[PDB]
Structures are given as structure tokens and as C-alpha cells.
Structure 1
Amino acid sequence: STGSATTTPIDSLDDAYITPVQIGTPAQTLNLDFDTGSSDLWVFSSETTASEVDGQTIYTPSKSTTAKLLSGATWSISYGDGSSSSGDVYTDTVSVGGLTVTGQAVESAKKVSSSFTEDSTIDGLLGLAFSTLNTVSPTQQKTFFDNAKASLDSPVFTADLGYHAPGTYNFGFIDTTAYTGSITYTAVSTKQGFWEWTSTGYAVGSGTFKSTSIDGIADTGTTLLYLPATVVSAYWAQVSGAKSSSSVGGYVFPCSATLPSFTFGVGSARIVIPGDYIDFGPISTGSSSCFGGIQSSAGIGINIFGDVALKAAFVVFNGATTPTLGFASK
């Protein structure tokens, strides 16, 4: 089997991407944030504290003939940005782009933090990291991808995120029309439960490539590119007026600037992030100070190849027995 679903930016800054997902019988379609940095499929629901729902579409398990309470199971998750959610668990039929999994754990939110409430466009998350990170207790549950894997034509999914445009998540096949040149594959460590890999270095603009190992995670659920302070300093040093602002929470730069591209290495291959992708616009409405899309990972504990990086590539998440990651230009 295979599946193919369009993913769409939630706003004009590509802050996140939503993908329609069918849950239950008859189908309830919710727009979920596919997150290769976590491993819970959770949704706003008929159980979510009413004051914490503001425009989201909710899953109502009592209206699904295939929903079953997973007795005794609860979940609770905290994300890198400090947001969180928790609740109880149903199993139900879940379909993405024509690919159907029966008995998928669908984690129903009883509580969500303010950042989720305030984002009316995101009805929940669909985790695509390794199932070892799943938070369901006392019996950990499998991700949609892990459940689907045995049925897939090939044990892979691909992320093709757009810059200010729709893109695609495919399951079970590699669309050879969706990228240019070749796909370069690189080793993955699952020791931390993430799609963790090592970039071979970077360049700033038309500068020379610096060969250096940068361990990080491929994370579709993170907006920006978070890299070591040395790398980030080298980038912003090429932008007149750029500075790190503790009051704003990162690098800012004059909105009048032209930003250089940023290149990252994948083996001997190179992925180029255009400068435009790195401009996240005014720090506040009407400001002439703009927020950078490359930020230091120093306060995080891990480097993160978020959407800023991933949307410059066609990315293969290979979930074979020995997992790997593939990157191609597009």
C-alpha cells in the first residue's frame, strides 16, 4: 500500500504545516501537524476542556463506530517550545492520503497549553519519530508509520515541504519526479528516539564550505534551523546590522537586509537554503526589525534541522531495519 497527502503552511510565514487526516467511521477529518520530532498522535476532541478550544475541529469518539476506549491508558507530552498536552486514549481507524491503519492509538486531549489553543489551524499532531518516544502509559503505543510499515510497498515516508506553497507527505514510495539529481543517504541514530543524523558541514552564501560534523535531528515539527553558536554567528556576521537580542529571544536583523543563502552538507552532497527562507519577518507588527530563521541551539541541547532546512529538500525517512535519511535538491 501507499498514501499521499498534501501538506499546507498554516500561515504566511510557514510557521507549521497541516495535513488532512481521516479518523473514525464515518470519517472525521482533522488537520494535523506531522511531526518527525515526536511520536504521539493526539487530537483536540469532545473531551478537551472547553475553554482551551478556540476554533479547532474536534474528534468525537462517541460518533465513530470503530472507536474504542483503550482502558486505563493516559498520555502527557511536553514539547521543545514548552507547549504541552495530555489526556486519555482511543483506538480507531486512521487514514492519511488513502493509506489506512486500523487500531491506531488516537490520543484524545483533555488539556492543551495556550499555544495550542491559540493556534486555530492545528487540530492535533501526528508523530513520526520512533515509537520509543511515545508517551502513552502504562502501555506505550506505536506511531501511524510504525503501524503502517508492514503494509507499505517500501518502509519509508517522504517530506516535501513547500516554501509559501503546499507540499506533500508520501508513505510507502519515493516519487522520483519530486526531486532533482540524486538522493544522498546518511546514517541515522535512533538512540534518542529521533531521526538523528550528522551533517558534514556548512557554507554561508558564496563562501567556502566548512567541513565539520554537526549532529542534529530532522524535525518537521520545528519551524526554524537551530545550529551551534559558532555556525550561527558565522552566518549572521554576513548580514549588516544583525545581532542577537536577549529581549527578543534570538538573532534579529534589519528588514531591509538581503540575506545570504545557507548550505548544509549531506555526505558529499549540498543542500542550499535560499536567503529568503531565513527571513521570518517583523518581530512585531510594523517593526523594521526582522526575526532570523537560523538560531543558536545552545540553550536546547540538540541541533534541529527544522522546516527552514527541510523545505529546501526532498527528504526520505527510511524506516528499514537500519534506518537512514535521504536528502535531494528539488
Structure 2
Amino acid sequence: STGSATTTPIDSLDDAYITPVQIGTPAQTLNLDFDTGSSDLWVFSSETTASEVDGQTIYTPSKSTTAKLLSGATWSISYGDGSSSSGDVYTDTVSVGGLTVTGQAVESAKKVSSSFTEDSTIDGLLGLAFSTLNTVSPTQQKTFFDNAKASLDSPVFTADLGYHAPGTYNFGFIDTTAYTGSITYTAVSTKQGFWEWTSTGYAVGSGTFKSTSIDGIADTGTTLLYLPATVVSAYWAQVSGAKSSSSVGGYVFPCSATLPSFTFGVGSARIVIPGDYIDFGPISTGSSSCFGGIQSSAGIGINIFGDVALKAAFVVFNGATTPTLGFASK
């Protein structure tokens, strides 16, 4: 089997992407944030504290003839950005882009933190990291991809995120028309439960490539590109007037600037992030200070290849017995 679903930016900055997912019988379609940095499929629901729901579409398990309470199971997750959610668990039928899993754990939120309530466009998350990170207790549950894997034509999914435009998540096949050149594959460590890999270096604009190992994770659920402070300083030094602002929380730059590109290495291959992808717009409405899309990972504890980096590539998440990651230009 295969599946193919369009993923759409939630706003004009590409802050996140939502993908429609069918849950239950008859189908209840919710728009979920596909997240290669976590391993829980959770949804706003009829059980979510009413004051914490503000415009999201909710899953109502009592209206699904295939929903079953997973007796005794609870979940609670805290994400790297300080957000959180928790609740109980149903199993139900879940379909993405024509690919159907029966008996998928659907984690129903009883509580969500403020940033989730404030994002009316995101009805929940669909985790695509390794199932070892799933938070369901006392019986850990499998991700949608892990449940689908055995049935897929090939044990892979691909992320093709758009810049200021829709893109695609495919399951079970590699669309050879969706990228240019060849796909370069690179080793993955699953020891922390993430799609963790080592970039071979970077370049700023038209500058020379610096060969240096940069360990990090491919995280579709993170908006920006978080890299070591040395690398980030080298980038912003090429933008007149750019500076790190403690009050704003990162590097800012004059909105009148033209940003240089940023290249990262994948083996001997190179992925180029155009300068425009690094512009996240005014820090507040009407400001002439703009927020940068490349930020320091110091204090996060890990480097993160988030959407800014991933949307410059066609990315293969190869879930074979020994997982690997593939990157192609597009």
C-alpha cells in the first residue's frame, strides 16, 4: 500500500504545516501537524477542557463506531519548546492520503497548553519519530508509520515541504518526479528516538564550504534551523545590522536586508537554503526588525534541522531495519 497527502502552511510565514487525517467511522477529518520530532498521535477532542478549545476541530470518539477506549491508558507530553498536552487513549481507524491503519492509538487531549489553544489551525499532532518516544502509559503505543510499515510497498515516508506553498507527505514510495539530481542517503542514530544524523558542514552565501560534523535531528515539527553558535554567528555576520537580541529571543535583522543563502552538507552533497527562506518577518506588527530563521541551538542541547532546512529538500525517512535519511535538491 501507499498514501499521499498534501501538507499546507498554517500562515504566511510557514510557521507549521497541517495535513488532513481521517479518524474513525464515519471519518472525522482533523488537520494534524506531522511531527518527525515526536511519537504521539494526539487530537483535540470532545474531552478537551472547553476553555482550552478555541476554533479547533475536535475528535468525538462516541460518534465513531470503530473507536474503543484503551482501558487504563493515559498520556502526557512535554515538547522542547515548553508546550504540553495530556489525556486518555482510544484506538480507532486512521487514514492519511488513502493509507489506512486499523487499531491506531489516538490520544485524546483532556488538557493542552496555551500555545495549542491559540493555534486554531492545528487540531493535533501526528508523531513520526521512533515509537520508543511514545508517552502512553502503562503500555507504550506505536506511531502511525510503525503500524503501517509492514503493509507499505517500501518502509519509507517522504517530506516535501513547500516554501510559502503546499507540499506533500508520501508513505510507502519515493516519487522520483519530486526532486532533481540524486538522493544522498546518510546514517541515522535512533539512540535518542529521533531521526538523528550528522551533516558534513556548511557555507554562508557564496562563501567557501566549511567541512565540519554537525549532529542534529530532522524535525518537521520545529519551524526554524537551530545550529551551533559558531555557525549561526558566521551566518548573521554577513547581514549588515543583524544582531542577537536577548529581549526578542534570538537573532534579528533589518527588514530592509537581502539575506544570503545557507548551504548544509549531506555527505558529499549540498542543500542550499535560499536567503528568503530565512526571513520570518517583523518581530511585531509594523516593526522594521525582522526575526531570523537560523538561530543558535546553545541551551537546547541538540541541533535541529527544522522546516527552514527541510523545505529546501526532498527528504526520505527510510524506516528499514537500519534506518537512514535521504536528501535531494528539488
Tell me the TM-score range normalised by the shorter chain. over 0.9
Separation in 1 of the partners of 2:284 and 2:203? 30
Separation in 2 of the partners of 1:230 and 1:186? 24
Separation in 2 of the partners of 1:105 and 1:241? 49
What is the DSSP-based 3-state SS (H/G/I as helix, E as strand, rest coil) of the residue aligned with 1:75?
Answer: strand
Separation in 2 of the partners of 1:200 and 1:117? 39
**1:28 has 2:25 as partner:** no
TM-score w.r.t. the length of structure 2 is 1.00
Cα deviation, residue 285, structure 1: 0.3
CA deviation string 1:46-72 (max 9, x = no partner): 000000000000000000000000000
Separation in 1 of the partners of 2:231 and 2:137? 39
Cα deviation, residue 286, structure 1: 0.2
Separation in 1 of the partners of 2:11 and 2:281? 12
What is the DSSP-based 3-state SS (H/G/I as helix, E as strand, rest coil) of the residue aligned with 2:177?
Answer: coil
What is the DSSP-based 3-state SS (H/G/I as helix, E as strand, rest coil) of the residue aligned with 1:277?
Answer: helix
What is the DSSP-based 3-state SS (H/G/I as helix, E as strand, rest coil) of the residue aligned with 1:312?
Answer: coil
Separation in 1 of the partners of 2:232 and 2:278? 12
Separation in 2 of the partners of 1:254 and 1:133? 40
Separation in 2 of the partners of 1:194 and 1:207? 31
Partner residue in 1 for 2:115: 115
Structure 2: segments with no counterpart, 5+ residues: none
CA deviation string 1:74-99 (max 9, x = no partner): 00001111000000000000000000
Partner residue in 1 for 2:156: 156
Separation in 1 of the partners of 2:272 and 2:259? 13
CA deviation string 1:140-193 (max 9, x = no partner): 000000000000000000000000000000000000000000000000000000
Separation in 1 of the partners of 2:253 and 2:99? 44
What is the DSSP-based 3-state SS (H/G/I as helix, E as strand, rest coil) of the residue aligned with 2:226?
Answer: strand
CA deviation string 1:258-278 (max 9, x = no partner): 000000000000000000000
Cα deviation, residue 298, structure 1: 0.2
Cα deviation, residue 236, structure 1: 0.2
Separation in 2 of the partners of 1:205 and 1:79? 32
Partner residue in 1 for 2:207: 207
Q: How many residues align?
A: 330
What is the DSSP-based 3-state SS (H/G/I as helix, E as strand, rest coil) of the residue aligned with 1:19?
Answer: strand
Alignment of 1:67-106 (within 5 A): 67-106=67-106
**1:324 has 2:319 as partner:** no
Separation in 2 of the partners of 1:52 and 1:82? 17
TM-score w.r.t. the length of structure 1 is 1.00
Partner residue in 2 for 1:192: 192
Cα deviation, residue 292, structure 1: 0.2
Separation in 1 of the partners of 2:124 and 2:133? 17
Cα deviation, residue 299, structure 1: 1.3
Runs of 4+ in 1 over 3 A off after TM superposition: none
Separation in 1 of the partners of 2:116 and 2:46? 16
Separation in 2 of the partners of 1:64 and 1:265? 47
Cα deviation, residue 73, structure 1: 0.2
Separation in 1 of the partners of 2:229 and 2:305? 14
What is the DSSP-based 3-state SS (H/G/I as helix, E as strand, rest coil) of the residue aligned with 1:231?
Answer: helix
CA deviation string 1:26-63 (max 9, x = no partner): 00000000000000000000000000000000000000
Partner residue in 1 for 2:237: 237
CA deviation string 1:208-264 (max 9, x = no partner): 000000000000000000000000000000000000000000000000000000000
What is the DSSP-based 3-state SS (H/G/I as helix, E as strand, rest coil) of the residue aligned with 2:108?
Answer: strand
Structure 1: segments with no counterpart, 5+ residues: none
Separation in 1 of the partners of 2:68 and 2:51? 26
What is the DSSP-based 3-state SS (H/G/I as helix, E as strand, rest coil) of the residue aligned with 2:175?
Answer: coil
CA deviation string 1:107-159 (max 9, x = no partner): 00000000000000000000000000000000000000000000000000000
Partner residue in 2 for 1:283: 283
Separation in 2 of the partners of 1:35 and 1:79? 11
Partner residue in 2 for 1:315: 315
Separation in 2 of the partners of 1:177 and 1:253? 37
What is the DSSP-based 3-state SS (H/G/I as helix, E as strand, rest coil) of the residue aligned with 1:85?
Answer: strand
Task: State percent identity of aligned pairs.
Answer: 100
Separation in 2 of the partners of 1:306 and 1:169? 15
